[PDB]
């Protein structure tokens, strides 16, 4: 398709990072080249061609839905924003646009 894409490898990395971070909220910037998210810009959440597609963060609760706070984060920068949630299984994730609307990510 012609929508944003994400590598299965990055999803695995993200979900494992979330599991490792639990119960804290893991957060990082989604990056890569062309039209595929396949790299991460790690951020201190614990107490050529490269581009920043947006952000990804985890929820320690079983909800992958965004809060009002998340919407304010999504609007600051980046086109895409992923939220992963407990139990962090293969399908425990959802992607949203800069406005908080759920959008697709083709897994490649």
Question: For Zn ion, which stretch binds (CB under 5 A), given 14-22, 30-38, 69-77, 98-106?
Answer: 69-77
Q: Which of 13, 70, 79, 108 binds Zn ion (CB under 5 A)?
A: 70
Whether 24 has a binding-site annotation, put simply, is no
Q: What is the dihedral sign for C-alpha 9, 12, 15, 19?
A: negative
CB atoms within 10 A of CB 20: 11
- By CB under 5 A, the count of residues binding Zn ion is 1
Whether 57 has a binding-site annotation, put simply, is yes
Q: 102 CB contacts (<8 Å, ≥6 apart)?
A: 94, 95, 96
Residues that bind Zn ion (CB under 5 A): 70
């Amino acid at each position: 398709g012609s929508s944003m894409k994400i590598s299965r490898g990055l999803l695995k990395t993200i979900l494992e990072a979330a599991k490792s971070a639990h119960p804290d909220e893991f957060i990082a910037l989604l990056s890569g080249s062309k039209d595929v998210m396949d790299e991460l810009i790690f951020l201190p959440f614990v107490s050529i061609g490269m581009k920043v597609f947006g952000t990804v963060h985890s929820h320690p609760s079983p909800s992958c839905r965004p809060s009002e706070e998340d919407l304010s984060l999504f609007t600051r920068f980046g086109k895409y924003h992923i939220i992963v949630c407990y139990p962090y299984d293969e399908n425990s994730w959802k992607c949203y646009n800069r406005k908080g609307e759920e959008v697709e990510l083709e897994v490649v």
